[PDB]
Amino acid sequence: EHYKARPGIASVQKATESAELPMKNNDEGTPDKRGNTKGALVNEHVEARDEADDATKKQAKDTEKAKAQVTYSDTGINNANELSRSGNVDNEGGSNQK
């Protein structure tokens, strides 16, 4: 061999194997074989807010800096109606206390 790869073939394959990863499976709020939901017993809006904060912390940890530039929480816009899927509700519409 004589040619050196100018973008760097190991670096490009190291990046694209991380871009290759499939989508995360969000089963939360869906029944199991027994008939129960698979959530965390907390309501939908607080689950969405907690979840955006967790993903902001993950974005901060992913780069080597401690404080994240790009954020998902407290973005300066009001989003008090957003509610993401949790297991407080069932498929009927009632609650899943028991």
Partner 1 sequence: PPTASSGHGYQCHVCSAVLFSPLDLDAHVASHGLHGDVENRKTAQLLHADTPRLVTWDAGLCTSFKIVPIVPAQVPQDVLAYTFFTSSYAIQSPFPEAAVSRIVVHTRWASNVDFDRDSSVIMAPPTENNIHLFKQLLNTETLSVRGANPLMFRANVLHMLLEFVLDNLYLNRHTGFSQDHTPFTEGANLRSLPGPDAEKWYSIMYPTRMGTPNVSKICNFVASCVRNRVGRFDRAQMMNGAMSEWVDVFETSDALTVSIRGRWMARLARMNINPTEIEWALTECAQGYVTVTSPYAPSVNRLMPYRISNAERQISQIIRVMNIGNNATVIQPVLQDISVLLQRISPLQIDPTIISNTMSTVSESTTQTLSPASSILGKLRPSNSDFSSFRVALAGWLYNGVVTTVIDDSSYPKDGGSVTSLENLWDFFILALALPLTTDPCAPVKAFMTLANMMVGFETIPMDNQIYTQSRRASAFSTPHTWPRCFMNIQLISPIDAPILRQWAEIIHRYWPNPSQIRYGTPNVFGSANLFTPPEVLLLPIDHQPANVTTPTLDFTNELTNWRARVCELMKNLVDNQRYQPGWTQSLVSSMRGTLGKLKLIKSMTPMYLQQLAPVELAVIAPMLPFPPFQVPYVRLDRDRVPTMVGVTRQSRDTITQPALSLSTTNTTVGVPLALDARAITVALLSGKYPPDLVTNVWYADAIYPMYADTEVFSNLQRDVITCEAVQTLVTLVAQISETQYPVDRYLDWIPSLRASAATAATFAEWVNTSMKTAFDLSDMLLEPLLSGDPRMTQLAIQYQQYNGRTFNVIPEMPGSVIADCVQLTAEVFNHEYNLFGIARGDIIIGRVQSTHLWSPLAPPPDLVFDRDTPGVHIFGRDCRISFGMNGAAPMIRDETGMMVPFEGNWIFPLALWQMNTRYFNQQFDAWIKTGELRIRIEMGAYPYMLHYYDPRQYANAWNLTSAWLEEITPTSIPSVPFMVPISSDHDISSAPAVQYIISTEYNDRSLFCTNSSSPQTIAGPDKHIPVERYNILTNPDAPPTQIQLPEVVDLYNVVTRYAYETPPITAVVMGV
Residue closer to partner 1 by CB (options 23, 98) is: 23
Q: Which residues bind partner 1 (CB under 8 A)?
A: 2-9, 11-26, 28, 48, 51-52, 54-56, 58-59, 62-63, 65, 69-70, 72, 82-85
**Least distance in angstroms from the C-beta of 98 to partner 1:** 25
**Least distance in angstroms from the C-beta of 92 to partner 1:** 19
SS3 label, residue 8: coil
| Region class of 13: left (phi > 0), else alpha (psi between -120 and 50), else beta | alpha
Exposed, middle or buried: residue 4 (CB in 10 Å: 0-12, 13-18, 19+)?
Answer: exposed
Exposed, middle or buried: residue 53 (CB in 10 Å: 0-12, 13-18, 19+)?
Answer: middle
**Least distance in angstroms from the C-beta of 26 to partner 1:** 5
Residue closer to partner 1 by CB (options 26, 36) is: 26
Q: Which tokens go with 4?
A: 């050196």
Residue closer to partner 1 by CB (options 4, 34) is: 4
Residue closer to partner 1 by CB (options 23, 34) is: 23
